[PDB]
Each structure stands twice: as structure tokens, then as C-alpha cells.
Design a protein around this ligand. Structure first.
Ligand SMILES: [Ca+2]
Ligand SMILES: [Ca+2]
Lengths: 257, 260
């Protein structure tokens, strides 16, 4: 009732078995030693998304250390109305279990009620040993734009090279892995795949109203929940959702093998 | 201005048909003299004796031991004023009979959201024990168990340094915390401090809720916080701390699974 009884490798597997209610389900990906709970989004078209990040009201402090970001934090709820981070370890187990690739959907919401998506095909989070590196093959489309591709903020020509995210390792204030002498995780106060910071950073500080400024932080860090290709760096989203689905769920190709 | 009914606490006053919230005299079993309390009486016959109220930043909570012992602020028949009833009275009421009391912490967002945290068998010890706070267990509530301690992640022992059960009371001029320094003096309040706090409803009132490390010279998280419902840099808009006999508490399970 509070936890549904259908299980599988992920939510798509669960939706396939006939599950049709979004809520909490246990899943045990392939190389997982033990099953764990996850929130599955299931729509009419039989698409079963496994949700791994959710922001919707700034009640959960996203300035957690490495272990926390690894294990997870926040709270799962049958209504999908709580903020959380499933945990790097779990995001890695799910994303790399088989030969079947996943697609990542970033879903964003305005303080004006406007939503936008951004898909990334062939998404994977590497193992801890490689600091949970993020990788995708390509941007599959979406009206939010491909901020993971870096952005030219105008502050420096090398901007796009330094604000891209594909290939970045995960960083937390206590485990810095950015292409920088400083610490993007500590100064922003979050855990993310930081470059010489970021163009899309859904784990930033939640600013009510969306609009924030250089005066909100002592050093004018643009540390809100941003997606530079959709909204300015000084506009923090109302809601974000990061979730994955087997790629096949998403015709001009000839299959050789 | 003051109601006629009286008793050992507000629940007693409710069982005697008091139907309006307001000021009432109560005389706990071990109390020598009766005193005024604000009683919250709902439509179910529950009478909550209120001992702390914050809602506009009018009263300054940086008071000393004697002041925290005797209480300060104002009581008002409308329940629109801020105060701290006094550790002595809170003590006399919580430890009057064998009957266990339950504490309800009611908080309010700057967005109109309200949440609660109930603790069972709530008690405030004698002044001799520096008014130590004790409760048996978190009886539920969507505000979360801030008193259990919180793992901010800054230090592995955060949870251990931020728990409140069994902590004595501290004011700037009477440090009884588990910290080398003075949580009370640094935050500027009186509370059951540990190596500071996970829940601290007597902190500084910040308009808008949001505040930061720059709000105070040394960067303290000294707002009205409840670490399990909102971030440490979120100061509540309103907070109420009230007690009712445990027998009146309707226990209900939550609908959230905590990952951490
Ligand atoms: Ca660095
Ligand atoms: Ca001390």
C-alpha cells in the first residue's frame, strides 16, 4: 500500500510487469547486493522512470559531504512531494547494470508554472573509484537547452570549456574533484559534477521567488539552482527532477549490429 | 481578560468546560502559588498549556538565567504576543504528577506552511539540575525529530553534538552546554544547548526566514531553526511550544521514508 509490491531492475522493468501507480517500489539492479526503495514515475504510455533527485521547496539542505552524497539524503514519499538525492552509489548501480543504456531527463519548473526538459542519451554515473564521473553520449533534445554542454557567460572566452559537465567527476566540499585550484562544491555549498564550476547545477541553493543576485552571497557566487541555457544564472528554479529511463523507451538508422 | 476556570494545567481546565483560548490561572500540584498561563483550547477538548511563542521578533530572547527562570515577554488573551513562561513554571507543570506530559512543537514557514513535532514524556528538571530537558521518544510529526540530533555533514559527530534530550539549560551567564565555548552567549538566547544545536526555537528572529553566515560577524546559524524541517539557514516565522497530558495525544504514522 505505502510500498508497492512489484519489483525489478528499475522502474521500467517494474512498469513492464504491470505496475501502473507512481509510488515507492523496491528495485534490485543487477550488481546490487541488496534491494532499495526508489520512487517510480509511471505514466499512461507504460513509461517507468526511476527518479534520483528532486527539489521543490528548499526544505532539504543540499550541502552534504561525500558520504552523504554517496548514500543519499532527503526523504522518499508515495506522492513524490519530498526533496532528496538517491545517492551516487545507487545512481551508479542502476545506470550501469546491463548493456541497455539509459537516458537522463532533467525536468525543470519555473516560478511562473512553466516546465522544460532536457534529455541526454546514454547516461552513466561511474563508480566511486572514478569519483562517480558523469557521462552521456549526446543531448537528445529538450526545450530547456543543453547546459551540460557548457555555456558562454561572457566573463571569459574559455567559459564554455569550463562550465561543461559531461565527463566531470563528482565533488563535495570535502572531496574536491574540479578543474580548479579552488572549490566549487564548497563555495556553492553543494555536491555536483563541477568543472571550473557549472552551466547547469540542480543541487544549488534554493532561492524563493527564483530571482536572486550577486548581493545574495558575499562573493556574488551564482550558486542557485540554475540551467543557463533556459534561464539566466541569477534565476533559481522552483522545481527540478532528475530521472532515468531505458533508452529504448525514447527512424533513420540501419542496424548493422 | 482572565478566565474563571482553573486547574492543575490547561487540559484540566478543558475537562471543566473551558472553551476559549486565553489566560487562565493554574496551580500545579507541587506549586505554592497559582500563576497565569495561556491555554490553547481546540474543538476536541484538548487544552494545551503554552510555554513559548515567537511570531514577530518583538521580544528579545537574549535574556539571562534569572529571566529565563522567571519568564519574560507578555501573555495576551489573543495569543498574539511572544514570551517564555519561565523554566520554573515549565518545571512545576511538567513534573507535577506521575501523569506523563507530551510536548508539541508547532512551527510556521514564511510561506504559510505549518508542521509539528511531538515528544512523549516531556520533562524539565529542577533548577538544581539546571532545568534539564528529558523526553522518552519522538512521538511523531512532519517537522521531524530535530531533538534527536542532525547530521549536517560538517563533522561525523554532528548528530551526537546536536542532540537535545537530557541537556541542561544554558544562558550566556550560565553555560551548562557540552561545548568548550558558549552556545548561549554566541547565539544570544537561552536553550538546552549541546555542542550547540539541531533545533533551537529561541534563536534570533530574521525577517523573511532566509539569512546567512554573513548575518552575524562570526557566521553563526543562530536563527529560529528546526534542522529536520528546513535548512540551518532558515529561521521560522512562528513557533509554539505547548504541553498536553500524553493521554490526549492522537498518534499517527508519517508518510515519508527518510534516506538521511
Ligand atoms: Ca579544486
Ligand atoms: Ca561551555
Amino acid at each position: 500500500v505505502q510500498i508497492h509490491d512489484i519489483t525489478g531492475k528499475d522502474c521500467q522493468d517494474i512498469a513492464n510487469k504491470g505496475a501502473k501507480q507512481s509510488g515507492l517500489y523496491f528495485i534490485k539492479p543487477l550488481k546490487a547486493n541488496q534491494q532499495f526503495l526508489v520512487y517510480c514515475e509511471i505514466d499512461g504510455s507504460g513509461n517507468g522512470w526511476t527518479v534520483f533527485q528532486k527539489r521543490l521547496d528548499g526544505s532539504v539542505d543540499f550541502k552534504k559531504n561525500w558520504i552523504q552524497y554517496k548514500e543519499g539524503f532527503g526523504h522518499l514519499s508515495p506522492t513524490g512531494t519530498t526533496e532528496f538525492w538517491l545517492g551516487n552509489e545507487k545512481i551508479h548501480l542502476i545506470s550501469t547494470q546491463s548493456a541497455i543504456p539509459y537516458a537522463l531527463r532533467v525536468e525543470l519548473e519555473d516560478w511562473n508554472g512553466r516546465t522544460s526538459t532536457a534529455d541526454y542519451a546514454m547516461f552513466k554515473v561511474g563508480p566511486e573509484a572514478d569519483k562517480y564521473r558523469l557521462t552521456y553520449a549526446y543531448f537528445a533534445g529538450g526545450d530547456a537547452g543543453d547546459a551540460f554542454d557548457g555555456f558562454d557567460f561572457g566573463d571569459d572566452p574559455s567559459d564554455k570549456f569550463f562550465t561543461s559537465h559531461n565527463g566531470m567527476q563528482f565533488s563535495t566540499w570535502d572531496n574536491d574533484n574540479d578543474k580548479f585550484e579552488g572549490n566549487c562544491a564548497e563555495q556553492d555549498g553543494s555536491g555536483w559534477w563541477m568543472n571550473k564550476c557549472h552551466a547547469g547545477h540542480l543541487n544549488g541553493v534554493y532561492y524563493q521567488g527564483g530571482t536572486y543576485s550577486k548581493a545574495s552571497t558575499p562573493n556574488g557566487y551564482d550558486n542557485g539552482i540554475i540551467w543557463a541555457t533556459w534561464k539566466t544564472r541569477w534565476y533559481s528554479m522552483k522545481k527540478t527532477t532528475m530521472k532515468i529511463i531505458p533508452f529504448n523507451r525514447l527512424g533513420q538508422q540501419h542496424h548493422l549490429g
